[PDB]
Paper text:
We designed six variants with the standard phylogenetic strategy (encoding 20–37 mutations from WT; designs WHT2476–WHT2481) and three with the ProteinMPNN-based PSSMs that exhibited fewer mutations (17–26; designs WHT2482, WHT2483, and WHT2484). To determine whether the designs retained the structure of the parental protein, we determined the crystal structures of WHT2483 and WHT2484 (19 and 26 mutations, respectively) to 2.4 Å and 1.9 Å resolution, respectively. The best, bearing 19 core mutations relative to PvRBP2b, expressed 16-fold greater amounts (up to 11 mg/l), and had 14 °C higher thermal tolerance than the parental protein. After the three-step purification process, WHT2482, WHT2483, and WHT2484 showed increased protein yields up to 9-, 16-, and 10-fold, respectively, compared to parental PvRBP2b169-470. WHT2482, WHT2483, and WHT2484 had final yields up to 6, 11, and 7 mg/l of E. coli culture, respectively, compared to 0.7 mg per liter for the parental protein. The main surface change is the reduction in positive charge in a patch on both WHT2483 and WHT2484 compared to the parental construct due to the introduction of the charge-swap mutation Arg418Glu. This is reflected in the overall reduction in the calculated pI from 9.2 for parent to 8.9 and 8.8 for WHT2483 and WHT2484, respectively. Comparison of the binding footprints of the human antibody panel with the mutations introduced in WHT2483 and WHT2484 reveals that the binding surfaces are largely conserved, with few of the introduced mutations being within the antibody bound surface of parental PvRBP2b169-470. There are three introduced mutations which fall within the antibody binding footprints, these are Lys248Leu and Met324Phe which are present in WHT2484, as well as Gln378Leu which is present in both WHT2483 and WHT2484. The interaction of 241242 with Gln378 is mediated through the peptide backbone which would remain unchanged in the stabilized designs. Our results show that WHT2482, WHT2483, and WHT2484 bound all nine human antibodies with affinity in the low nanomolar range.
Numbering used by the authors:
A (entry chain B): 28 to 329
B (entry chain A): 28 to 328
The structure:
C-alpha cells in the first residue's frame, strides 16, 4: 500500500507580523489574487486604465519572483523530503546506517531551514506587495469623483462573490477536520498504551514521526479554514447591511481593498485546503500500514 | 454633561507582531489572567508549589508595572480627551478660537502619540510576559510524570470554563454590533444627503467627528468579539472531541497553556466588550442630540 510521502507542499510560513503567509503553491501569496481582482475592478473605470500595464509588468513580475524564490529553496526541500521518506518508512530506514535520533534532529533542523528559506527569499517580494498596494491607491485618485463616487461596481462584485462562496461545501470541511483530529488523538492514545508494554524499535519511531507530521498538517488545515470562514463572513455581512449609493473616493479605495483581499483570501485558502486535504489522507494511509506492522510485532512479543 | 465624552478607554493597541494587545483596562494584558489561571492549575500539583511565590512576586509586580506604564501616558490622554470634547461639542467649539481643521489635526497627532505611548512604555513588560511563560514551562518539567501525565485537572478546568462561557450571551453581542453598524452606516448616509441642503458647518463637523470615532470603536468591538468567539470555539471543540486520560509531559504543558490562554482571552475580552458597548451607546446619544440640533437649524431656514 501507500508508505512514501511523495509531496511535501503542506509546509508554509508567515512573516513576523503574521500579515503575509507564504505557500509553496503559486501564486504563493493571496495578495497576487487581489492584484488580479483589481484588474477586474479597474476595467470598469476608464480613469485608471493604466493599471493594465502595472499588472502586466509589476504584478506578473512579482508572481514570477515569488515562484523564483520558492525555487531557490528547492534543494532544501528535496533534502527534507529525503529525511521524511526515511523516518516514515521502516524499510527505507533499514537501508542506511544513521540512528533514528540523529535523523530526527536533522529533520527539525532541515524543517526550520526550509521554512526559514521560504520567508527569507521572499522578504523583498513582501515589500513589493506594499509598493504595488500604494501604487494602486495613488492610481485610484485619478477617478472623476470625490464625494459622490458610485458604489455600483463595489456592490456588483459582492453579489458575484457570494455565488462563488456557495461553490465551497464549508460543512464538508468542518466535518472532515473534526473526524481527522479525533482519529489522530485515538491513534496517539493507542500508541501510548502499546509502548507501555513493549519496545518496538524502528516501527514505533516511524509511526510517531508520521503522527507528529499529521498534527502539523491538522493545525495548518484549521488555520486556513478559519481564514476562509472569516473572509466569507465579512463579505456576507456587507451584503446583509444597508447599501449606500455614493461614498467619498478615499472610502471607495478602502471598499475595493476590503472586498478584493477578502476574495483573494477565499480563492487562496480554497486551493490550500484542497492540498492539505490530500496530504492528511495520504499520511493516514501510512499510519494504517504502520499500525498493522506494529500489531504484528506485539503478537510475537507476548 | 451634554455631548461630552468623559471616558476614552476605548483606545487600544497591539504590538508589531500582533501577539499582544494592550488595553487601558486592568490587567492591561490578557496574559495576566493566564498567569492567574495557572495559579489554579499549580494548586493541584504539589510538584510545582513554587509558582505560589512566582505569582505573588513576578506576576503581581508585572501587573503593577503595567499599570504604572499606562499611567505615564496620562498627560497625553488628558490632552486627547480635551480635543475630543471640543471636536464633538459645537457649544465647546464656539467657546474657543482654534479652527476645526487645526483641532482635527491635533486630534490625529495626539491619538497616535497616545496609542504609541501605550505600547512603547510597555515594551519591557511584554518581554517580562515571555520570561514568566518560559519559567512556567521550566517549572512544569518538575512534574513527577513523563509518559503517563494524568489529564484529570485539564478536564476538570474545561468543564468549569464551559459553564462560564454560557454566562456570556454571544448572540446578544453579535445582534448588537450588526444592528449598531447598520445604524452607523445610515447616520453617515443621512449626513451625506443633509449637508447638501444646509450650511450648518459647526454642527455638521461635530457629527462627522463623532461618527468618525464611532467607526473606530465599532472596529474595536468587532476585533474583541472575534477573539472571544474563537476562544470559546476552540475550548468547546476540545470538549466535543476524544478525551485521552494520560499524555506526555510536553503534551500536558501545551494543554495547560492552550486552555489557560483561551480562558484568559475570554475573561479579558468580556470586560473589553462591555466597555466598548457603553462607549458606542454614549457616542450614539451624542449623534441623536446633534441630529436634533441639526433638524432644528434646518427648520429655521
Amino acid at each position: 500500500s501507500t508508505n512514501t510521502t511523495d509531496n511535501i507542499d503542506y509546509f508554509d510560513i508567515s512573516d513576523e507580523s503574521n500579515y503575509y503567509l507564504i505557500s509553496q503553491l503559486r501564486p504563493h501569496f493571496s495578495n497576487i489574487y487581489f492584484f488580479d481582482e483589481f484588474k477586474r475592478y479597474a476595467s470598469y473605470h476608464t480613469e485608471i486604465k493604466r493599471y493594465e500595464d502595472i499588472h502586466k509588468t509589476k504584478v506578473n513580475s512579482l508572481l514570477n519572483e515569488a515562484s523564483r524564490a520558492i525555487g531557490i529553496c528547492n534543494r532544501l526541500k528535496n533534502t527534507l523530503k529525503g529525511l521524511i521518506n526515511i523516518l516514515e518508512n521502516p524499510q527505507k530506514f533499514k537501508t542506511q546506517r544513521e540512528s533514528y535520533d540523529v535523523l530526527l534532529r536533522q529533520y527539525e533542523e532541515k524543517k526550520e531551514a526550509f521554512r526559514g528559506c521560504l520567508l527569507n527569499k521572499n522578504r523583498k517580494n513582501l515589500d513589493q506587495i506594499k509598493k504595488i498596494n500604494n501604487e494602486i491607491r495613488d492610481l485610484l485618485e485619478k477617478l472623476k469623483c470625490s464625494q459622490d463616487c458610485q458604489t455600483n461596481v463595489y456592490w456588483d462584485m459582492i453579489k458575484i462573490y457570494l455565488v462563488d462562496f456557495k461553490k465551497m461545501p464549508l460543512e464538508n470541511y468542518d466535518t472532515f477536520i473534526k473526524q481527522f483530529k479525533n482519529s489522530y488523538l485515538s491513534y496517539v492514545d493507542l500508541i501510548r498504551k502499546i509502548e507501555k508494554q513493549i519496545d518496538d524499535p524502528i516501527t514505533l519511531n516511524a509511526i510517531k514521526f508520521v503522527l507528529k507530521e499529521m498534527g502539523y498538517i491538522i493545525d495548518r488545515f484549521e488555520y486556513h479554514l478559519q481564514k476562509v470562514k472569516h473572509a466569507i463572513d465579512q463579505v456576507t455581512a456587507l451584503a446583509d447591511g444597508v447599501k449606500p449609493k455614493q461614498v467619498t473616493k478615499n472610502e471607495l479605495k478602502e471598499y475595493y481593498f476590503n472586498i478584493g483581499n477578502y476574495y483573494a483570501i477565499f480563492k487562496f485558502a480554497k486551493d490550500q485546503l484542497n492540498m492539505l486535504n490530500k496530504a492528511l489522507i495520504h499520511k493516514e494511509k501510512i499510519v494504517h500500514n504502520l499500525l498493522g506492522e506494529l500489531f504484528g510485532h506485539l503478537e510475537e512479543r507476548i
